[PDB]
């Protein structure tokens, strides 16, 4: 969690749930990464319970979020002369999206009651629309490479966290403990109970 600060300055660094200041103390069991690109007016749409463009038709976000998002400007790489047509969105759809659901199709939307079904025209349009990154365009249309670093609560043995030093433990003494992100004060004594190996 230290080699990501030399890429580009961060326009926003909001973090629902886990606070960024303490990413080293916690230790999670699985890390989810969702990478895509957004325009300047589209930055606020990466948030729980939003609508319109992304959090309703393209990338639905769950109501409860304990992860973090990292946003930075990529004008030097993705933005080209007369824009880039590789990045798209979906604007027309019959229904909404479940959280963390990806959709892809080559079909065209049926806006009206006319059974077009493969033929463009009135009340039948392509759901995918391209957007460009021109230098003449303002900040509202700029390449913003973002990632969704989703997390979850401690319900499994932790796997990925920072390289904190693990010192040797002691028994039958008043010593603080830090076991996979949880901390407390007490004594550590051997117990004769039994724990299933899972």
């Amino acid at each position: 969690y230290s080699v990501l600060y030399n890429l580009a300055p961060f326009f926003t660094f909001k973090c629902y749930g886990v606070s960024p200041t303490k990413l080293n103390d916690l230790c999670f069991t699985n890390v989810y990464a969702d990478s895509f690109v957004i325009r300047g007016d589209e930055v606020r749409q990466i948030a729980p319970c939003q609508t319109g463009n992304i959090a309703d038709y393209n990338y639905k976000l769950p109501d409860d979020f304990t992860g973090c998002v990292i946003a930075w400007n990529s004008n030097k790489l993705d933005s080209k002369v007369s824009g880039n047509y590789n990045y798209l969105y979906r604007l027309f759809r019959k229904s909404n999206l479940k959280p963390f659901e990806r959709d892809i199709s080559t079909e065209i939307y049926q806006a009206g009651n006319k059974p077009c079904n493969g033929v463009a025209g009135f009340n039948c349009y392509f759901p995918l629309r391209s957007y460009s990154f021109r230098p003449t365009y303002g900040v509202g249309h700029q390449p913003y490479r973002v990632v969704v670093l989703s997390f979850e609560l401690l319900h499994a043995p932790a796997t990925v966290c920072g390289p904190k030093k693990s010192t040797n433990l002691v028994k039958n003494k008043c010593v603080n403990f830090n076991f996979n992100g949880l901390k407390g004060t007490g004594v550590l004594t051997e117990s004769n109970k039994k724990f299933l190996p899972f």
Epitope: K80, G83, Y85, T106, A120, S132
Partner: antibody
């Protein structure tokens, strides 16, 4: 802009041919160049495009393994080479250019060719 | 998958000339259509792009539309500079490659 191409060449069935198109007057690092062939008796037939900065290329179903793509951004030229050409390849070569970047497959429906290179005529007969 | 076109077209001066270009359901409608014109003994040039959009430097006598399946266009009047063939172009999702028509060489009567 200016898009010059190699002159007319002559060839023999079963041999290899090589043509090149030079890009000038615009930034080469982010503008795609498409390759199309025009034979007498029919219309244009699409062949493929080359990424000027990247290396991923896409080819047609009829020319999946027949064509080869080579690029060199130091001199801003695109090298087009054909191997084991058939006898019905007597046609002209156009180094068609499209605005913007279209490395992905899905951007072709909003893609058009603005400026075209000169016709590189090749004569192939037994 | 194939884009048919008549080999040639004829028309008297000062009269519209009908040009037909038809394709499949995935060739037309699923993807946009494009039109180009080629000078004799030269390189082709862009004429019509983005369906009904007309570029700068190209006059208004070219009226074109893709309709639903068959793309048809007419030219208001005829001149000596309009003796060029026209190529209709569109994208095919199944073929994953561009297709072009045969061409209609308009002859002035």
């Amino acid at each position: 802009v200016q898009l010059v191409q190699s002159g007319a060449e002559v060839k023999k069935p079963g041999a290899s041919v090589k043509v090149s198109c030079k890009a000038s007057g615009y930034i080469f690092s982010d503008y795609n160049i498409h390759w199309v062939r025009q034979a007498p008796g029919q219309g244009l037939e699409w062949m493929g495009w080359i990424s000027p900065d990247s290396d991923d290329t896409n080819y047609a179903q009829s020319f999946q393994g027949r064509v080869t793509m080579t690029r060199d951004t130091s001199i801003t030229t695109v090298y087009m080479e054909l191997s084991s050409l058939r006898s019905d390849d007597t046609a002209v070569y156009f180094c068609a250019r499209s605005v913007g970047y279209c490395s992905l497959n899905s951007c072709q429906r909003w893609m058009w060719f603005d400026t075209w290179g000169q016709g590189a005529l090749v004569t192939v007969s037994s | 998958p194939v884009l048919t076109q008549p080999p040639s077209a004829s028309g008297p001066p000062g009269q519209s000339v009908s040009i037909s270009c038809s394709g499949s359901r995935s060739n037309i409608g699923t993807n946009f259509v494009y039109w180009y014109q080629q000078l004799p003994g030269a390189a082709p040039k862009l004429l019509i792009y983005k369906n009904d959009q007309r570029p700068s430097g190209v006059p208004e006598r070219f009226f074109g539309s893709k309709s639903g399946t068959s793309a048809s266009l007419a030219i208001s009047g005829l001149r000596s500079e309009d003796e060029v063939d026209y190529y209709c172009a569109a994208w095919d999702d199944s073929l994953s490659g561009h297709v072009f028509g045969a061409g209609t060489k308009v002859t002035v009567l």
